[PDB]
Amino acid sequence: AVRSHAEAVQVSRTIDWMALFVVFFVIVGSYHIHAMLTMGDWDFWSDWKDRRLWVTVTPIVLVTFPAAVQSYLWERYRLPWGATVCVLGLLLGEWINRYFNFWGWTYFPINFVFPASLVPGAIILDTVLMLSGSYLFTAIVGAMGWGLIFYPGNWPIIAPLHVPVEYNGMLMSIADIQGYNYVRTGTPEYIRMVEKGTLRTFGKDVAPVSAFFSAFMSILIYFMWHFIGRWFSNERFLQST
Amino acid sequence: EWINRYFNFWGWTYFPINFVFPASLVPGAIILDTVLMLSGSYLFTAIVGAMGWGLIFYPGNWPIIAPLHVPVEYNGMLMSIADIQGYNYVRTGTPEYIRMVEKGTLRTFGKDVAPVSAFFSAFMSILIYFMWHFIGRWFSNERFLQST
Amino acid sequence: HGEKSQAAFMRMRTIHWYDLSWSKEKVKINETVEIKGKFHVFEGWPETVDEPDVAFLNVGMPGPVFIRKESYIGGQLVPRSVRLEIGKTYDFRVVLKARRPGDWHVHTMMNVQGGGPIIGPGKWITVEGSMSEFRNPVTTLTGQTVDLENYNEGNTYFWHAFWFAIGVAWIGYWSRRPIFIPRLLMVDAGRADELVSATDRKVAMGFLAATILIVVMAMSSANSKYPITIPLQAGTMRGMKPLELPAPTVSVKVEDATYRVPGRAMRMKLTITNHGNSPIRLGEFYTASVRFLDSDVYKDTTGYPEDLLAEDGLSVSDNSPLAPGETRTVDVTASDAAWEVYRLSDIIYDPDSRFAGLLFFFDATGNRQVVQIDAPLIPSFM
Amino acid sequence: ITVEGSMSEFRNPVTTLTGQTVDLENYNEGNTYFWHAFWFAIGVAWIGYWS
Amino acid sequence: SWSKEKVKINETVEIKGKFHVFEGWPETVDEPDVAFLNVGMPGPVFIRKESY
Amino acid sequence: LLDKKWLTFVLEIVTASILWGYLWKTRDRNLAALTPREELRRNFTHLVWLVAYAWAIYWGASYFTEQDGTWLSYPIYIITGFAAFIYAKTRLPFFAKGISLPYLVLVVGPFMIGFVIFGWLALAVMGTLTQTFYSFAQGGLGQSLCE
Amino acid sequence: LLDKKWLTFVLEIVTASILWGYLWKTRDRNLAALTPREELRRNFTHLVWLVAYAWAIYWGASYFTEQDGTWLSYPIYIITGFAAFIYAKTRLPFFAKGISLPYLVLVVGPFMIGFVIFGWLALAVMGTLTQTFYSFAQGGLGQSLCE
Ligand SMILES: CCCCCCCCCCCC(=O)OC[C@H](COP(=O)(O)OCC[N+](C)(C)C)OC(=O)CCCCCCCCCCC
Ligand SMILES: CCCCCCCCCCCC(=O)OC[C@H](COP(=O)(O)OCC[N+](C)(C)C)OC(=O)CCCCCCCCCCC
Ligand SMILES: CCCCCCCCCC(=O)OC[C@H](COP(=O)(O)OCC[N+](C)(C)C)OC(=O)CCCCCCCCC
Ligand SMILES: CCCCCCCCCC(=O)OC[C@H](COP(=O)(O)OCC[N+](C)(C)C)OC(=O)CCCCCCCCC
Ligand SMILES: CCCCCCCCCC(=O)OC[C@H](COP(=O)(O)OCC[N+](C)(C)C)OC(=O)CCCCCCCCC
Ligand SMILES: CCCCCCCCCC(=O)OC[C@H](COP(=O)(O)OCC[N+](C)(C)C)OC(=O)CCCCCCCCC
Ligand SMILES: CCCCCCCCCC(=O)OC[C@H](COP(=O)(O)OCC[N+](C)(C)C)OC(=O)CCCCCCCCC
Ligand SMILES: CCCCCCCCCC(=O)OC[C@H](COP(=O)(O)OCC[N+](C)(C)C)OC(=O)CCCCCCCCC
Ligand SMILES: CCCCCCCCCC
Ligand SMILES: CCCCCCCCCC
Ligand SMILES: CCCCCCCCCC
Ligand SMILES: CCCCCCCCCC
Ligand SMILES: CCCCCCCCCC
Ligand SMILES: CCCCCCCCCC
Numbered sequence A: 001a002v003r004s005h006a007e008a009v010q011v012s013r014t015i016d017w018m019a020l021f022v023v024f025f026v027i028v029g030s031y032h033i034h035a036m037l038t039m040g041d042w043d044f045w046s047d048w049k050d051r052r053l054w055v056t057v058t059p060i061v062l063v064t065f066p067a068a069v070q071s072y073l074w075e076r077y078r079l080p081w082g083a084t085v086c087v088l089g090l091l092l093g094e095w096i097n098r099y100f101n102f103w104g105w106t107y108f109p110i111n112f113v114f115p116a117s118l119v120p121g122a123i124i125l126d127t128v129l130m131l132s133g134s135y136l137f138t139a140i141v142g143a144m145g146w147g148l149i150f151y152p153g154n155w156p157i158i159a160p161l162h163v164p165v166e167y168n169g170m171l172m173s174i175a176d177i178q179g180y181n182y183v184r185t186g187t188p189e190y191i192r193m194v195e196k197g198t199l200r201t202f203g204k205d206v207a208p209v210s211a212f213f214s215a216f217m218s219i220l221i222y223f224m225w226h227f228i229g230r231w232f233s234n235e236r237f238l239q240s241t
Numbered sequence B: 001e002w003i004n005r006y007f008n009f010w011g012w013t014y015f016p017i018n019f020v021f022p023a024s025l026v027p028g029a030i031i032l033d034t035v036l037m038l039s040g041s042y043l044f045t046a047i048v049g050a051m052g053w054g055l056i057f058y059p060g061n062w063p064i065i066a067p068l069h070v071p072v073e074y075n076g077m078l079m080s081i082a083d084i085q086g087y088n089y090v091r092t093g094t095p096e097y098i099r100m101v102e103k104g105t106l107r108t109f110g111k112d113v114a115p116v117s118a119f120f121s122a123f124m125s126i127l128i129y130f131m132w133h134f135i136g137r138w139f140s141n142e143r144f145l146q147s148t
Numbered sequence C: 001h002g003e004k005s006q007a008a009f010m011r012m013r014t015i016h017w018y019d020l021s022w023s024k025e026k027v028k029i030n031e032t033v034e035i036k037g038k039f040h041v042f043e044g045w046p047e048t049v050d051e052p053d054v055a056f057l058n059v060g061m062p063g064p065v066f067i068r069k070e071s072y073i074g075g076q077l078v079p080r081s082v083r084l085e086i087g088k089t090y091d092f093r094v095v096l097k098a099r100r101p102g103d104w105h106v107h108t109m110m111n112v113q114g115g116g117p118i119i120g121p122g123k124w125i126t127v128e129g130s131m132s133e134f135r136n137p138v139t140t141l142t143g144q145t146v147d148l149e150n151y152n153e154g155n156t157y158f159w160h161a162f163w164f165a166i167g168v169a170w171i172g173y174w175s176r177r178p179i180f181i182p183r184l185l186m187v188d189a190g191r192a193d194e195l196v197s198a199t200d201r202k203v204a205m206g207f208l209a210a211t212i213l214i215v216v217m218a219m220s221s222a223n224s225k226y227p228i229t230i231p232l233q234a235g236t237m238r239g240m241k242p243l244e245l246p247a248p249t250v251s252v253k254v255e256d257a258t259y260r261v262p263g264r265a266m267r268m269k270l271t272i273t274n275h276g277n278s279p280i281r282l283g284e285f286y287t288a289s290v291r292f293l294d295s296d297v298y299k300d301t302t303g304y305p306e307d308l309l310a311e312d313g314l315s316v317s318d319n320s321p322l323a324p325g326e327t328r329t330v331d332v333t334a335s336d337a338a339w340e341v342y343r344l345s346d347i348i349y350d351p352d353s354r355f356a357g358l359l360f361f362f363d364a365t366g367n368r369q370v371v372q373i374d375a376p377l378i379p380s381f382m
Numbered sequence D: 001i002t003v004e005g006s007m008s009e010f011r012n013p014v015t016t017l018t019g020q021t022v023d024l025e026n027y028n029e030g031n032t033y034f035w036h037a038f039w040f041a042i043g044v045a046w047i048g049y050w051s
Numbered sequence E: 001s002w003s004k005e006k007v008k009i010n011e012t013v014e015i016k017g018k019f020h021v022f023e024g025w026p027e028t029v030d031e032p033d034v035a036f037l038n039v040g041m042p043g044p045v046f047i048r049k050e051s052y
Numbered sequence F, G: 001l002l003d004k005k006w007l008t009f010v011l012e013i014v015t016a017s018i019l020w021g022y023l024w025k026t027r028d029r030n031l032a033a034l035t036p037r038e039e040l041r042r043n044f045t046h047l048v049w050l051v052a053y054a055w056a057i058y059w060g061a062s063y064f065t066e067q068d069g070t071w072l073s074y075p076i077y078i079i080t081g082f083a084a085f086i087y088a089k090t091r092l093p094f095f096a097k098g099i100s101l102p103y104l105v106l107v108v109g110p111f112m113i114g115f116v117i118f119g120w121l122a123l124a125v126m127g128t129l130t131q132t133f134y135s136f137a138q139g140g141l142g143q144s145l146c147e
């Protein structure tokens, strides 16, 4: 068995550290895969970070894993930082790769290939979860907060990249100039699913309307992935694979 | 398939048998059945036997269709024996443009069309087998409803 | 470098590049090298590739070793996607500025909406110096000059580090106490209702309010500083001016084409019809990034790459000058090691054995007429 | 269009680039029959063994 | 050109003119392969008798 | 002793054969005769094996996957996962006598890696970890915890 | 006797009416008073009716369906299936006192035959056949079997 009280606490602390390690890295791997093959195209390039498609899509496909991890961690240990550990791990992997391969192997500038920020969304999702522990209240309010605060969260970073510039007779943004200058062999300009204008966009409402649509779709995706995580949390003992 | 090919495709109409022959799947069935009973694990079956079914399909039919791929110069254009057969024997309801066949792509590198497609079919067959195992499991219920 | 892998016929009949010239072969850092030439979109565009209704003029290089300073189709800047018409001829000019020292294979590629990359012929360009000397200045409409190599880098690092630090502080606050097993046991054995109590709720309210408040002030400061902002510029540019090539006076109809399997030669039969009033001579056969030249007729002086150039790889059975009005049938053979080096002989593996190319006819005066040929390609084995 | 005769007289010759002339009416028919019959026999043998 | 500025009920007012489709049609809007000549008014206050 | 320093510390097909076989051939037949101290000692080693899995997944699914995006590890974490499967199924009790559904999904999903659907299966680590926690709190559950 | 030679052996609407009515009007009211020998005798006839269904489906869904592809039986197997439904529901015991879900799906799916979804419902023959096997092994289960 175990000898005494204090060394039992030491064993529990060692288990705590090892479990934190394993969960953190498994979430990094899986969530990184999902973000890469659902959203990574928009997160790669500053000129790709538009205001309609990027804002619409990123929260919808990025609330998936935080929902499941929250639904498990809260229900099983009263730990309100699942969304946090997911976002921090994704950002860690993204930044390590940006600095080691995007800038180390290749030489794309960091201000050109910087990733998106989601820590405010994770923090809101985690507080609205633990406070008022109602999962439905979380999926209603915290998901709306995650969707709404995404673009204003990244505004301090991308705002300097939207300064108008007259580039050889055509108006360009700093992000557009960066994309034009630093070539991307595999990612030409026409692939950029960005705001190209519509005859049904009234006034200055592209960012808010997209933000609200992303918030509602994030509510739906959170509601789905809570149940997906609930099953991913089973302890079934099958007897015949 | 064979009864109909010989009685209607060749009896009512007159499409040649070497033109309307069906595909062979007995090797896939045999592999799926052995990998099932041996190592009775259903997950092991869905992983290995499905891969075998997907991978051995085209090499299984290669002995039959290989003679039909001999290049031929037909009136100034290169054609295969199968292409010549399709050009000669007319199909009123099935024109050439309907043929969802390999038409080339700018992202097919070297000689890999057959293997890449075979592996993709194998993985998708794994997924479909995993789904249809559960569909069959329900199709195997003995429920006694009391009020249709 | 992404070629010699794409489909053989697809490289042969997609887009033909000619008149290519490179301003420099060896450059130092911050020097500008310009690539000029003309590309012709083939009339018989393959069905499996979408028509170039939305296309981009790109440059194929191993990473941003050169920055694309400028790019023109015709006479206008083309920083965004453009529309190309089938069969028309355009000329292009791309300005490249050195950024990374070393040897790079600069390819002038084309990207189409539903067909992926279209790699053109590439020339080796040597770059000497160091990356530290590279500068990319730009002047905005606000009235400030900034270097794109490090613009906003400090701000991005600061904001990302601040948010990561906030997340780390949160997780450390909730990880100071024992984490997994004791808390699981508390929540399992009866109601826990002890792991979340004041002042945990109060500090959580503090974190939430602080996050919202910091986001709000950060958005209002990024609105005060840099008060003039515009959205990202995008949208395909139509109305691209094509080159008004004169109508060729030479009519060529191909009577079958064969190539040896295995082999390095392409054999074909031609019936050249000469109109006008000049005696012409066939000098070149550009099929896919490979120029088969007849040394007795024309010689390449544009610094075209050696591995893509056949100085005497084109042999004509009867290359005597053709009098105007006179028509004759001749046998044309194009043999070179490049035909197998770039795997132009793998079209037997391809499901569409057709070829297209350009023939350059030169007369005594020295000018040339460009004509285009296409015909089924029948391999020979015996 | 009226056609007179019999189907047995019909011939569809073709010459390949390999250097052989084959009739498309019965080319590869024997090989197809043999392979299909062999695979069907293998399946029947398996099911009979387990039956 | 507008035929009339003030009309009574059952009177007919005719709008004439020419419209030119721009060569540089925006990509985000589909080409006018299928288009309709309509009239923008606050409800059927005018009935479109004819259109050419 | 308890947790040691194992934590700090063609070929792919070959390495899988010995590694999977070695753990399976040396299987403990008398799983009943386990002292809780010996259970706790071996129990750490199982968690150490999962630590190797976490490093392999992150090195495999995070570093190299986007490395293709800029443009081995998949079999590496495949081997680690399947080896740890036999490892816990034979050495750790309460985890034998029945295949754990979440842990099986964990070892199979990332193995057969369409990637979006199949990267979701790595979320089974949560159920795996709570099952391993229940294995932790079998003999050495207390006291301290719940007291 | 047991199995006999029945195995070897506008109009569509009309034939359905009598065939369905005849089996239903002659229904056995005292299903309790069945000797197992009489149960076994009638039990073969129910399997013979399913044999007619199998011939009708193959003639209907295999021969004539692709016959359209080269370019009656659907109502034929509809009638056979529904007639056999009343047949087993009235004559065979342990199959009454509740509609069998798989056998109902079997008789309805191919009846309402989009065809890809609805051809899947013919897989209910498996549950139907195991239920009919349990009906087989009610009185005449042994001995021999399980001995
Ligand atoms: C729990 C809930 C958490 C909510 C988190 C929201 C943080 C505050 C952001 C306010 C933005 C705003 O109102 O301003 C609108 C403008 C966009 O306007 P535009 O028409 O595109 O023109 C451009 C104008 N620029 C140049 C000044 C930016 O701002 C943005 O760029 C972000 C728009 C999407 C988010 C909308 C959130 C609305 C409040 C939600 C809570 C009731
Ligand atoms: C339990 C698992 C069962 C596996 C069953 C596979 C049977 C063997 C077939 C080998 C084919 C091959 O390797 O050769 C590749 C070539 C295709 O090449 P191509 O680039 O299209 O060029 C054409 C070259 N011709 C002219 C010689 C054909 O063959 C084929 O036509 C079949 C390709 C798809 C199947 C790939 C299976 C790979 C092995 C899988 C097991 C590890
Ligand atoms: C694709 C989206 C996710 C779908 C997940 C579906 C999982 C459904 C549940 C499951 O695993 O099925 C178990 C059965 C075998 O059951 P039994 O062998 O009867 O086990 C007895 C105990 N038990 C019934 C409680 C399990 O089925 C089996 O034969 C096991 C199949 C393999 C399961 C592990 C791999 C899962 C990959 C998604
Ligand atoms: C399209 C893809 C396949 C979907 C199949 C869904 C089947 C769901 C189960 C089912 O049949 O539903 C039964 C209920 C009626 O139940 P009850 O009358 O309460 O019967 C009591 C006993 N029982 C609850 C165990 C059945 O519902 C009913 O009222 C019966 C509906 C008719 C079932 C037979 C036809 C199925 C066609 C697909
Ligand atoms: C490739 C995709 C895998 C499909 C998933 C199926 C497996 C999932 C369930 C599972 O792992 O169970 C198999 C055993 C666990 O013990 P059991 O399944 O109870 O049976 C033990 C006896 N057996 C070794 C012959 C199986 O585990 C083992 O014994 C494995 C070790 C022995 C194999 C070593 C040889 C392999 C060399 C390549
Ligand atoms: C180049 C490949 C070297 C792999 C070396 C494998 C070491 C052998 C695996 C093994 O059985 O255990 C090694 C350690 C310590 O656990 P052990 O106690 O030795 O395992 C048996 C438990 N028992 C003693 C009570 C019977 O358990 C561990 O935690 C070792 C983790 C090693 C990381 C996984 C490396 C896999 C790379 C493909
Ligand atoms: C068209 C699609 C069919 C929808 C599926 C619904 C039927 C599925 C369940 C079913 O077959 O049960 C009905 C009875 C079985 O006995 P019960 O349902 O227990 O009720 C018997 C009394 N009843 C005859 C008035 C119904 O079975 C019969 O009694 C049928 C024989 C009597 C009908 C003969 C007249 C029809 C002539 C056209
Ligand atoms: C032209 C249409 C002629 C259809 C003739 C239907 C024959 C009457 C149906 C029938 O009730 O049973 C006939 C045979 C033998 O079973 P029976 O014993 O006569 O049925 C009643 C059982 N009982 C005597 C214990 C009360 O049971 C069978 O296995 C007969 C199978 C007939 C094949 C189905 C033909 C349907 C074509 C639409
Ligand atoms: C679209 C979200 C659907 C969620 C289903 C929840 C089912 C829970 C069963 C326990
Ligand atoms: C689409 C979300 C469905 C999640 C499945 C959860 C099932 C739980 C059963 C215990
Ligand atoms: C995507 C994960 C959803 C898991 C499927 C639920 C099936 C469990 C039935 C017992
Ligand atoms: C895509 C395959 C989903 C399989 C679901 C299995 C559910 C089984 C419940 C008994
Ligand atoms: C998509 C596969 C779902 C199969 C349904 C099986 C349900 C079984 C419940 C007993
Ligand atoms: C396609 C067949 C799947 C059957 C549906 C399962 C529903 C059964 C719920 C009791």
Ligand SMILES: [Cu+2]
Binding pocket: C001, C002, C105, C106, C107, C122
């Ligand atoms: Cu190159």
Ligand SMILES: [Cu+2]
Binding pocket: C015, C016, C040, C041, C042, C043, C372
């Ligand atoms: Cu051309």
